[PDB]
Design a protein around this ligand. Structure first.
Ligand SMILES: C[C@@H]1CC[C@@]2(OC1)O[C@H]1[C@@H](O)[C@H]3[C@@H]4CC[C@H]5C[C@@H](O[C@@H]6O[C@H](CO)[C@H](O[C@@H]7O[C@H](CO)[C@@H](O)[C@H](O[C@@H]8OC[C@@H](O)[C@H](O)[C@H]8O)[C@H]7O[C@@H]7O[C@H](CO)[C@H](O)[C@H](O[C@@H]8O[C@H](CO)[C@@H](O)[C@H](O)[C@H]8O)[C@H]7O)[C@H](O)[C@H]6O)[C@H](O)C[C@]5(C)[C@H]4CC[C@]3(C)[C@H]1[C@@H]2C
Ligand SMILES: CCCCCCCCCCCC
Ligand SMILES: CCCCCCCCCCCC
Lengths: 49, 59, 116, 91, 49, 119, 49
């Protein structure tokens, strides 16, 4: 496998302090109102913490 | 086996040589540490005299 | 004798194309061999911009100090930005100028000759 | 000169300039930064704010104006007509 | 465009003053006294001829 | 975390000789509680570890250690000095010669020589 | 130069000739034979010090 190299790199798309907070990650969001029978269309995978 | 005094003295004598030889990589002319950590009293960057061709101010 | 298009629209000769072709080939050949161009080489510039900036700053600071005032240092790229988050953002312009030192000066092609 | 208007590039430049002018006319705030944006987002007068904060307040005011315009002028007109069967992708 | 037209770019900053920190605020770990009579804090009066 | 390293490196890992200055956090295999902001280690590095011969200096506390290191911990013969009073007088506006004259004897008397096993 | 315009020189042509070289002297131009055009008869590295 190609070897990973750990060299720090300089800022891009943001100032050095922060990271990309508003990046979209595919993970379902749960509504507080109970849904009796409705598939989430995306399994939450590993359920336990 | 605990070191005796002559062994400790020799170890320190060689360690000082090692430190002196290692301290020659400390101020790379154009590097991130040199550009970002060499500052004056107010914290502003300073122009270190490390030009390969220019020796200013009678140096 | 042949039409060769209207005279209103400008035409380029063949001498210019030949000169361009020969110039490109000669530039590549001269860049490949530094020491063969009549014993000399080909240089893009005369003085490095950093050298000129350092000399000018030295002279200006000398003149200001001799005049009885605290000398100032002129930065390539721009001055600071009044911010309270991080040190890199405050001095981003000068750092941006200085971070291009190697690409600005050194050539992209290999300096020496291999396989010959 | 109509000769300038004949060329495509001049027409494109004029259209871009007109779009920019309309956008600036409809989104640029005036007096609403200190009144609404600045106090709401920082709770400080705009003058005391850092230069990078005043821009944020102005952007917030402009975005509020843009949303107000797009709701009260375009969407009311285009939504007075109800959902017209809402065509959907069949495949 | 406002900055370009209003001539407000003449207020840009290009120069900063350089102030030498004293030994108290300097790298005290580098300062060392040799023979009890000298030290490594070098400061000569520029060029004197 | 503003930890800085300057020296020889293989691939992308510190390797050979160099100087490392610690900021917030730690590095070079040292424990998280050993270092402070501004401390430095000068000497041999191997596979990112402070392995070999070196010197550890702490400007905040004054501890100076010279000697052997294994992995990221002191292991072998070493010499320890506590130059805290010298730095204390230096930071209070006293010229180096006067501070050295005041605090040379006490520092010289408290020089320690030790053998360390796994720290 | 390729179009080979030839005519008696007027003041405007002479000033164009002057201005071309005046503006060209302010840019970075290719130089042959370095290390000789940079020499100086003094204890310096160039003539600008
Ligand atoms: C920084 C921005 C981008 C550059 C720009 O604006 C500033 O420069 C402006 C200016 O240069 C305009 C040009 C001025 C000169 C014009 C010349 C014109 O040629 C037409 O036909 C003849 C030439 O063939 C005559 O000229 C005739 O008179 C003219 O009708 C051409 O058709 C449009 C033209 C080139 C214009 C195109 C649009 C521009 C380039 C504008 C262009 C957006
Ligand atoms: C050249 C394209 C832009 C020109 C018009 C500028 C629009 C903003 C003007 C604001 C005036 C208060
Ligand atoms: C490129 C934008 C700034 C150009 C300014 C050039 C002249 C600066 C003079 C400053 C005098 C205080």
């Amino acid at each position: 496998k190609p070897l990973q190299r750990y060299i720090p790199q300089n800022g891009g798309f943001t100032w050095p302090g922060d990271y990309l907070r508003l990046e979209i990650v595919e993970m379902p969001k749960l509504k507080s109102i109970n849904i009796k029978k409705t598939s989430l269309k995306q399994k939450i995978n590993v359920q336990p913490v | 086996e605990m070191c005796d005094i002559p062994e400790i003295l020799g170890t320190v004598q060689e360690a000082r040589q090692i430190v002196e030889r290692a301290r020659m990589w400390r101020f790379k002319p154009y590097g991130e540490v040199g550009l970002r950590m060499a500052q004056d009293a107010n914290g502003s960057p300073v122009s270190l005299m490390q030009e390969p061709l220019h020796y200013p101010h009678g140096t | 004798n042949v039409y060769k298009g209207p005279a209103s629209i400008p035409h380029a000769s063949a001498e210019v194309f030949g000169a361009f072709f020969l110039a490109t080939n000669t530039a590549l050949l001269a860049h490949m061999f530094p020491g063969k161009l009549f014993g000399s080489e080909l240089h893009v510039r005369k003085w490095d911009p950093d050298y000129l900036a350092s000399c000018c700053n030295e002279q200006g600071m000398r003149r200001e100090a001799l005049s009885g005032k605290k000398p100032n240092l002129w930065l390539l790229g721009g001055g600071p930005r009044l911010v309270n988050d991080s040190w890199e953002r405050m001095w981003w312009n000068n750092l941006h100028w200085k971070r291009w030192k190697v690409p600005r000066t050194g050539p992209a092609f290999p300096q020496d000759m291999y396989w010959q | 000169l109509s000769g300038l208007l004949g060329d495509i590039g001049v027409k494109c430049t004029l259209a871009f300039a007109g779009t920019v002018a309309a956008g600036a006319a409809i989104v640029v705030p005036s007096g609403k930064q200190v009144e609404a944006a600045s106090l709401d987002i920082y709770g400080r007068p705009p003058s005391q704010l850092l230069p990078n904060e005043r821009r944020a307040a102005e952007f917030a005011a402009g975005h509020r104006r843009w949303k107000g315009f797009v709701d009260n002028s375009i969407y009311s007109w285009t939504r007075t007509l109800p959902g017209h069967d809402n065509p959907i992708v069949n495949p | 465009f406002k900055n370009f037209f209003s001539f407000s770019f003449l207020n840009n900053i290009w120069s900063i003053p350089i102030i030498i920190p004293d030994i108290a605020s300097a790298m005290i770990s580098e300062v060392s006294v040799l023979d009890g009579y000298f030290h490594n804090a070098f400061t000569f009066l520029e060029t004197s001829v | 975390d503003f930890t800085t390293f300057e020296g020889l490196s293989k691939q992308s890992i510190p390797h050979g000789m160099g100087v490392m200055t610690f900021g917030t956090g730690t590095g070079a295999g040292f424990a998280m509680s050993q270092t402070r902001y501004g401390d430095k280690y000068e000497g041999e590095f191997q596979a990112g570890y402070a392995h070999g011969l070196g010197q550890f200096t702490s400007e905040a506390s004054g501890e100076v250690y010279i000697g052997e290191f294994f992995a990221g911990q002191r292991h072998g013969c070493g010499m320890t000095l506590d130059m805290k009073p010298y730095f204390y007088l230096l930071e209070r506006g006293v010229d180096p010669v006067e501070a050295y004259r005041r605090t040379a004897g006490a520092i010289m008397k408290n020089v320690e020589v030790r053998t360390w096993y796994r720290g | 130069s390729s179009k080979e315009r030839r005519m008696a020189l007027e003041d405007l042509s002479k000033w164009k000739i002057f201005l071309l070289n005046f503006l060209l002297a302010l840019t970075e131009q290719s130089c042959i034979y370095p290390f000789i055009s940079n020499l100086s008869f003094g204890p310096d590295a160039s003539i600008l010090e």
